[PDB]
């Protein structure tokens, strides 16, 4: 490590620790930037050399974390928990957590290389027999094909192509990650991930939230299963069993908005999927980002800086260059460079994804002057929620009308139910998946789920929570969890379950602050500077204050609460119950063993 | 509650608590007796009227528990946790725990009736083809001796459907009432109360650490047996990389595999260690089996069975038509006189082991009958379940079988040792995953992790995860396959048996050392060792007067459960099965976890 990056000498007291933290954040800005820059060069251009460079930068980051973590323990390990400055206590506690820097040098290299190789496998995997990529090809098949056999070939092809080669690498990664964080005092890596929420009863609190939300998912599930039965028949749909996992519009069955046109109860009413209109009007990726930006500036939040427009990758490159297409937002920790990398497609759900990613950017811009250790969300779920809150207003029929994507809708009951159903397909359907992914990974990290049960336990959870089943037989050669981006790319997932609850709490708070008075699901905070001010306070706080205090300042409550979500969907929650009762539906999937048969003469 | 049974007055300090505790135990003995008597009358003669009498006896026990429990809390709830005498803290702590007596009268009656009706359903269920088969003996003998895939399937499916399906609504109601009761005692759910009997803050982690050490032995036995079954049933019904169909292992619950020993025995030219056929040839009856078990106990200078045991016990299924609970059990009537076994005894070697298991309970009762009633239990429940099994470890040795005339030829060679250890593994190692999983299931039900909508999903998740078996016909949540196992509807906790199967080898090692035996642990026979008897007697006479960790330390030199004695016992066959599976190219485990067998072509015609 460069001598200028190595830590100096400081007194072993709170005053010296304050100086220590300043010198830490000073040098960390330079180390973080070279790491983020090298990761960016790789993710927008996957090659062996860029992987080599990214691993060089990761090693330097670990050397830096080792030097500064060791110094923090030498000086402050006995005393930092009694410092009077709470923000200093948070900084010092972080620096003394070394993570992968606890590993010997050889295992650091092994750890860094596993990350590079898992990333390459996921983002370069293809389904052949010409070859299809996940984004756009298989994504478009899953969203729009209504051919059981075609959807199956895409689902099986993708899960086999991505998951199988990842499994031996993921086993090695898990072992090294655990070895690293055990030396920080964590029982396993998952315990470190959960520690970010600073809640002794986190897992119980989540379970209690899901208990309040599960009736909503069960009724949506049964309603959608009934529509699928009519399209595909009794041979492929079991009205008392799990839904085949390839039929819900999405490779992971995690959001169901793409089958809206199959389940929309009133197709005579205006089409609330404005994708057709976006294409008819000539929207491109740049228009989508500019429209998202203008929502932020309407709230008197910040526009995207020139560095964002000049450096971002907003479309998949056409030079054949291989990229990580999964959408992501990037902070280079130099207070200047901020970018999105998205293989943007012109659809309504992509417009929502654009808002999601620009929410991260807005966060980055609002806390860019905090010390680096505080340049985080109040917790990770806060970061994933910011853009989704704005998209809730954008999706309203009235707002779509304002931006020319919808000829004004009549404010009738068929239309309110159409809208809340479409929103349920996007938000309620996701809840079980947002909850289960890290339940799976927590069990892998803890050792409850050894490699010999990776797929058994994954499908246990997928059936338990989502009520889906694999449409072809799976065994432990398969690694279907690995076919989801966040697993090989080691991005935690419980943040998205937290986000999907939190965003309705934020929405209710901002709508009240904006002066809105009508139904919560018709609120649009567009151009509310008061609502922007209340959001800006959250964003500028970073992680300087406990998320429970930041939340109470914003919404009046210091905990996650499902009531705003329930109040948002109240009308369609009632409607769905009635429909399922009238159709005599069974809620849930008591024939839990059921799997569909194979199409005749598949794969031909 | 009869005036003579109601609590009087005592001082609200520790010295008064000693007098309270002394008087509580004095009256508790009479309430215990009438309850056990009424349960005996019902279980040996299932009738509507005997069930009513048992429910009225249970209500009286609840009235007693409430009156004395409320008196303990009135006088001591804020102070008994600071008492200087830890044995007093134990008892005041038990009396403050009212259990089902926390329920209001109407719910007490509901609870008692649920227990009675769940017991009746399980023990009177039949599989009909006019002509109907009972679990014991009819279906038990099919599972043990039929090798017809279709006949075994008829018995397995028939039993699980007949017992499980009607139980499910009752079991849901029982679970809710049980939780409501124990939550008023301060437990998060009933399972937390059940686990508290082991007084170990790390109990669940301790069990998982034991199971990690044992699982490789199970995986290798499983792969070896699965190969033997494949050679008999064929590639259609056995998947060499999948779970074993749950009806092919000799036992309705696949929990002991001793009955398929003839298909797995590696060296059949050696003496046949399954002596059932010799017991039948020689005319053994139930009474002989109990007398031979008794004589092992007396050879150790432990107590014979008293006349009251022989006159009162039910040692055979009654031939007078009447319905009984056939599951083997041992009974303390809490009057220091009456002790009985109720078993529908069949003349087999595994039943001889069951006889020893039940007589181990009786011996415990005889040794601690003069302790105060609250301390008349095992150091923990796993101790109680291990006593008879320890003796049966000696009885089953080829040398001991020769002594009692059940094995003419004796041989001491490596092939005979492998045969013996494989037979013992079919009984002891095959059980371990099942002994561990049953209460994982039930803990999840009590905690609410497993709602009624997932009773069977979670049961079979655990059956496959631990035992590596699959149901041979499709199941759904109308089925309640956990309910087709005695201990679930009869509300008998199960982790005690996992504990016991580990503990019994710790006990065996210590008693063999005390007896002066200096050969391989699996050839030890403590028969006629009065030194071993005296060491076991010290455990039995302690009851629950002392923490089990201290009792274990005195007996075996360690204050914790330890898998090493079991591993040492099985070491030779552990290594042999590993080598055999490697040479045969076996896959350890069941990576085709989704696999289920097809149905027979003419099922169930
Ligand atoms: C659409 O129309 C609704 C009213 O109609 C409602 O929705 C239809 C689709 C049908 O299902 C109808 O049966 C149903 O009633 C408008 O909602 C109403 O807005 C007014 C004005 O904002 C609300 O009155 C306010 O209410 C609060 C307390 O709730 C008071 O503090 C205020 O002083 C004020 O009176 C009214 O409550 C509200 N109704 C409901 C059920 O929430 C909605 O504004 C309109 N939206 C659009 C975009 O056209
Ligand atoms: C079955 O046979 C085993 C093995 O017998 C041993 O090996 C054979 C190949 C021959 O060489 C035999 O002569 C030889 O003993 C018996 O196990 C052995 O038992 C003896 C005592 O009977 C043990 O010797 C004692 O060991 C202790 C120390 O452990 C000393 O204090 C004693 O002085 C004495 O030497 C011997 O260790 C033990 N061997 C093993 C490997 O455990 C076994 O007893 C026999 N069983 C029956 C039922 O006949
Ligand atoms: C319209 C919309 C809104 C929100 C989402 C969220 C929720 C579900 C999850 C998923 O699609 O499964 N999801 C993303 O994935 C988005 N994208 C990231 O969350 C990036 S910010 C995560 C990341 C990636 C790489 C490095 C660092 C961070 C999807 C779609
Ligand atoms: C040879 C042998 C040895 C041990 C056993 C044990 C272990 C497995 C378990 C079972 O067979 O599943 N098993 C019993 O069941 C025996 N019998 C009871 O354990 C009675 S003492 C429990 C009880 C019943 C009713 C009221 C109170 C207590 C089986 C076979
Ligand atoms: C089984 O239980 C029944 C009661 O449910 C017993 O029948 C009673 O027998 C006693 C004598 O022992 C008579 O005084 C009662 O009038 C009988 N009652 C009824 C309702 O029949 C029966 O004897 C018991 N059988 C055995 C073998 O003990
Ligand atoms: C895992 O599965 C692979 C793919 O085939 C699937 O499983 C077999 C058993 C059939 O049911 C087939 O229809 C399925 O599509 C197999 O090639 C592979 O051998 C299996 N792995 C193991 C370890 O058995
Ligand atoms: C549960 O299953 C019962 C019968 O068993 C199953 O029957 C058919 C449908 C096949 O799946 C077969 O392999 C099974 O054994 C049904 O009678 C009952 O309706 C099912 N319960 C529910 C709620 O669907
Ligand atoms: C991609 O990276 C390689 C290094 O592997 C570099 O030579 C090349 O210029 C990069 N391509 C683009 C388009 O930036
Ligand atoms: Cl997270
Ligand atoms: Cl127990
Ligand atoms: Mg989508
Ligand atoms: Mg058996
Ligand atoms: Mg037998
Ligand atoms: Zn995000
Ligand atoms: Zn027992």
Numbering used by the authors:
A (entry chain A): 1 to 129, 135 to 609
B (entry chain B): 1 to 129, 134 to 609
Study authors write:
ACE is a type I membrane protein that converts the inactive decapeptide angiotensin I (Ang I) to the vasopressor Ang II and inactivates the vasodilator bradykinin. ACE is composed of two catalytically active domains (nACE and cACE) joined by a 15-amino acid linker region. Despite the two domains sharing 60% sequence similarity, which increases to 89% in the active sites, they differ in their N-linked glycosylation, requirement for chloride ion activation, affinity for inhibitors, and substrate specificity. cACE is primarily responsible for the production of Ang II,13 whereas nACE is highly selective for the antifibrotic peptide N-acetyl-Ser-Asp-Lys-Pro (AcSDKP)14 and gonadotropin-releasing hormone (GnRH). Three mercapto-3-phenylpropanoyl inhibitors were synthesized, combining features of omapatrilat and LisW to probe structural characteristics required for potent dual cACE/NEP inhibition.
High-resolution crystal structures were obtained for the inhibitors AD014 and AD015 in complex with nACE (1.85 and 1.70 Å, respectively) and cACE (1.80 and 1.80 Å, respectively) and AD016 in complex with cACE (1.45 Å). The nACE structures crystallized in the P1 space group with two molecules in the asymmetric unit, while the cACE complex structures crystallized in the P212121 space group, with one molecule in the asymmetric unit. The exception is weak density for the P1 groups in the nACE structures, which indicates greater flexibility due to weaker binding. The less hydrophobic environment in nACE is also consistent with there being weak density in the 2mFo-DFc maps for the P1 groups of AD014 and AD015 indicating more flexible binding. Apart from AD015-nACE, all other inhibitor-ACE domain crystal complexes contain a water-mediated interaction between the ligand mercapto group and the backbone amino and carbonyl groups of Ala334/Ala356. There are no significant differences between the structure of AD015-nACE and the other complexes in this region, so this lack of water-mediated interaction may be a crystallization artifact. While the p-tolyl group of AD015 also shows hydrophobic interactions with equivalent residues Ser357, Thr358, and His361 in nACE, the P2′ environment is less hydrophobic, particularly due to Thr358. This, together with the less hydrophobic S1 subsite in nACE is consistent with the C-selectivity factor of 24. AD015 has an equivalent affinity for cACE as observed for omapatrilat, but the affinity for nACE is reduced by a factor of 10. This is likely largely due to nACE not accommodating large hydrophobic P2′ side chains.
